[PDB]
Design a protein around this nucleic acid. Sequence first.
RNA 1: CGCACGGAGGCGAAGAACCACAGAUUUCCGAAUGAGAAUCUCUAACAAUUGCUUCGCGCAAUGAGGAACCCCGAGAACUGAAACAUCUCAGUAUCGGGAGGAACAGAAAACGCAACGUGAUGUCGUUAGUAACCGCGAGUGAACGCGAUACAGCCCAAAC
RNA 2: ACUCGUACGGUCACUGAAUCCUGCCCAGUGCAGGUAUCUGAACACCUCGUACAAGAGGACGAAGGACCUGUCAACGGCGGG
RNA 3: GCUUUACUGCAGGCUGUCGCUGAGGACUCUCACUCCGGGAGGAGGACACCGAUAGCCGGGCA
Lengths: 119, 194, 46, 237
Amino acid sequence: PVYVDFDVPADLEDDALEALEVARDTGAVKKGTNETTKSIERGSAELVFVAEDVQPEEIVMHIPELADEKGVPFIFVEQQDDLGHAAGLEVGSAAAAVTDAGEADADVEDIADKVEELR
Amino acid sequence: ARSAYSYIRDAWKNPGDGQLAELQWQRQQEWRNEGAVERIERPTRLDKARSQGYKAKQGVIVARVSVRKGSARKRRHKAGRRSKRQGVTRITRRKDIQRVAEERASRTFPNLRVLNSYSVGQDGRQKWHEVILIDPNHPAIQNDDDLSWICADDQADRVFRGLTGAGRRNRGLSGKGKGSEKTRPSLRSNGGKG
Amino acid sequence: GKKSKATKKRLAKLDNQNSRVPAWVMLKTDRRNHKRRHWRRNDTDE
Amino acid sequence: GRRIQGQRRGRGTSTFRAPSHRYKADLEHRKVEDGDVIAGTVVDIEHDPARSAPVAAVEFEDGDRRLILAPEGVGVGDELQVGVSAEIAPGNTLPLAEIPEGVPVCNVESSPGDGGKFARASGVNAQLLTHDRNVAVVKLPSGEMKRLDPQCRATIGVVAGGGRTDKPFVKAGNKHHKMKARGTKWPNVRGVAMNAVDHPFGGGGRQHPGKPKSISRNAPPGRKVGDIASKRTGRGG
RNA sequence: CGCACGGAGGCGAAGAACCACAGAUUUCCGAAUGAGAAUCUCUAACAAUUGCUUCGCGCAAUGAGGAACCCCGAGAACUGAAACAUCUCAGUAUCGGGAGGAACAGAAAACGCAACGUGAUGUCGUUAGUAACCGCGAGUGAACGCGAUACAGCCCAAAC
RNA sequence: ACUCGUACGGUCACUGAAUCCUGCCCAGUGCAGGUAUCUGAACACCUCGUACAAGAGGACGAAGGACCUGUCAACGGCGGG
RNA sequence: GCUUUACUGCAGGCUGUCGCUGAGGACUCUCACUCCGGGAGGAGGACACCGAUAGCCGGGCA
Ligand SMILES: [Cl-]
Ligand SMILES: [Cl-]
Ligand SMILES: [Cl-]
Ligand SMILES: [K+]
Ligand SMILES: [Mg+2]
Ligand SMILES: [Mg+2]
Ligand SMILES: [Mg+2]
Ligand SMILES: [Mg+2]
Ligand SMILES: [Mg+2]
Ligand SMILES: [Mg+2]
Ligand SMILES: [Mg+2]
Ligand SMILES: [Mg+2]
Ligand SMILES: [Mg+2]
Ligand SMILES: [Mg+2]
Ligand SMILES: [Mg+2]
Ligand SMILES: [Mg+2]
Ligand SMILES: [Mg+2]
Ligand SMILES: [Mg+2]
Ligand SMILES: [Mg+2]
Ligand SMILES: [Mg+2]
Ligand SMILES: [Mg+2]
Ligand SMILES: [Mg+2]
Ligand SMILES: [Mg+2]
Ligand SMILES: [Mg+2]
Ligand code: NA
Ligand code: NA
Ligand code: NA
Ligand code: NA
Ligand code: NA
Ligand code: NA
Ligand code: NA
Ligand code: NA
Ligand code: NA
Ligand code: NA
Ligand code: NA
Ligand SMILES: [Sr+2]
Ligand SMILES: [Sr+2]
Ligand SMILES: [Sr+2]
Ligand SMILES: [Sr+2]
Ligand SMILES: [Sr+2]
Ligand SMILES: [Sr+2]
Ligand SMILES: [Sr+2]
Ligand SMILES: [Sr+2]
Ligand SMILES: [Sr+2]
Ligand SMILES: [Sr+2]
């Protein structure tokens, strides 16, 4: 909520999580806020995901400002458990990162372009 | 590279600036309507919690406690007292608000033991501290090579005997040399002059 | 006054304690009840 | 010294407490949403032990038996209406905005929906004077011009039991009986008749106060006796 | 066949008595815990607060005691100063909370015989009634070091 | 607590049924109101000082006080020539 | 024990200042906070309450 500056539509979120499911079975993904943060700093992150139901908000707070100065695109997911299942975990995830997509590079590029049109 | 934790830490260096200023303004409204001791699933300051000993494991409990701001809630003398002992207003307690918070939490959870605590802010009338408590009887902790020390019989009610980090600091045990003549090994052995 | 069942048991015991040291104990020890209580002169509990 | 009588008061002991268990009802206004379709018939006229004035027992349309603060000229059989579109008749409760100017009103609310705070004692009334979209000026029984919210409810008419203060008590026994029904320690022993240990005006070979009677507002409890922050004293001048 | 030397009777070579260890039994009240109650009663009980959780009191915890010792809090006054207020009595008496068989302390953001030196911590002897405090009055009062005792060093958080 | 109370109330005091009455004094003390001007602490602010600090000074100025007024069924006073 | 314009202090009241505390030397606002309302919502509002400090009064108490 405090780190959220734009609302992402349910349709765009469906596209995003589907692209993440095929990113783990082909390319490579980073699961968890610590690994997502290191990906943005190292530059290896292509697209970063962030949950909106994170309590406390401090865990994720830095991602929207850190990604802006590193050129890495970010998208908001409504639920924590949906992002965790999409990353391939039994538990939830506050943040996920796509470190070089696989056979979804065209979809990821479009998601990154649809988010910029939504500010 | 930097950890994600270092960002939670850097935000808490200035709790009146940035996104945290807005967060605390919102959170405190919910906290003021909450109880004296409120168990919370996850810590507000993950970095500080983990730094203090917290683990996302079974038997590790966190609880937020609110204690009132200010000096001693002192009653005026009802008998003869010399001028030096006639004060009410300027008397302050020897235990800090953090230690009062740790004790109140430990009493709400009789079976658990206080590991550590940290500040999560204040408003005009009260202060909030989150206390990390541990279950000495849970096998998830009795087998933990980092936390199983708290399971020993001599660690029973450790907070009430001042064995917490906040306990040891308030007892004046920080310095190992000059200034700690009346504090080490205990305040009591030194005739209560610390 | 109205007595309860427990009060009755206690008063009963006090009455039993009020008996003399039997004749045979005097012969066995080769020669006195110190807990001799009177209803008027002494006072019980409750 | 010893704590004065006014200090023993605040402790709230039996001697200083009101006989609440012998009291009838907390005379508040009814809770209506919006619609006015709440009216009732007066079943009985009872004596209120808390205020020494009469109180009307009313049964409402929805089946609620409540005791209401009775104005003058309200009897058994009479219909009383409570709400916004209520009739401008004596004994009806409607907000100050709907009540016309120059009409004596009683049981006035301070903040809208509290149930009535002002003009509740025997025979008194509040006078409604000025109207506005923001404020309703009411003249309280003391002669004070109280600026109130027009949404504050009030009952039309003067309070019942007028002229109670006109007849003297005559004897101490009558006072005794009245006081046994209130939250007051009675009789009153003068401070000037006490020992120094008991009151600031106590002591002396004869009866007179110690220092002057007009005490400062800033005076602590135990010393604040006599004429509290008096602007003036006496009759003349 | 207790204290306790009686009368009657009985037990013991089927090895009793007696002693050591272990076990059985172990009413009611009592932290007292199903609810109530001056040791009793009324109609299935971890009451209350917690952790885990199959989310069910299913598995666990706390409570109270103990000669003093120990640790954390609250904290007088008589008294001394030939009065008395700071000071002193004294962080004493007393009070609240809590652990153990011992507590507490403890591996340097130390010391500072200033060194090319020491090397976790208690404690004992000393340092010393020294430094320091103080209506600079009365009084108060360490430490480093040294000689001893005993010695033991380690684990996280983060980086990856 | 007063208070299931709301000034026809209830708090704080004085006097002490009724009847006839209750003079003069506000200088002191008390209480209260006002106040151009004067006085009036700390914080922040300005000058000096200190590579910082202690510290010295200035500006501003609350209640309060000075000053003015009201008040004796307020404490009290009602003399000498 | 008691008194007071005895000495020294301690409560308490009044008052400034700092924190809570926010947006656009006088003013507007609403988002904290307070109160009323069962609720919707209404009043008030960066004040008040509370924490801290400073000046005044302060036999109420030691
Ligand atoms: Cl503990
Ligand atoms: Cl009366
Ligand atoms: Cl050395
Ligand atoms: K003394
Ligand atoms: Mg010791
Ligand atoms: Mg017999
Ligand atoms: Mg009422
Ligand atoms: Mg009268
Ligand atoms: Mg009575
Ligand atoms: Mg009288
Ligand atoms: Mg007398
Ligand atoms: Mg006498
Ligand atoms: Mg007195
Ligand atoms: Mg007289
Ligand atoms: Mg007189
Ligand atoms: Mg029972
Ligand atoms: Mg003395
Ligand atoms: Mg002396
Ligand atoms: Mg002397
Ligand atoms: Mg000393
Ligand atoms: Mg040293
Ligand atoms: Mg008389
Ligand atoms: Mg309320
Ligand atoms: Mg005195
Ligand atoms: Na505990
Ligand atoms: Na000290
Ligand atoms: Na008897
Ligand atoms: Na036994
Ligand atoms: Na149990
Ligand atoms: Na259970
Ligand atoms: Na002497
Ligand atoms: Na003396
Ligand atoms: Na001194
Ligand atoms: Na005068
Ligand atoms: Na005496
Ligand atoms: Sr989760
Ligand atoms: Sr315990
Ligand atoms: Sr007798
Ligand atoms: Sr009400
Ligand atoms: Sr009311
Ligand atoms: Sr007198
Ligand atoms: Sr006159
Ligand atoms: Sr060693
Ligand atoms: Sr008369
Ligand atoms: Sr005057």
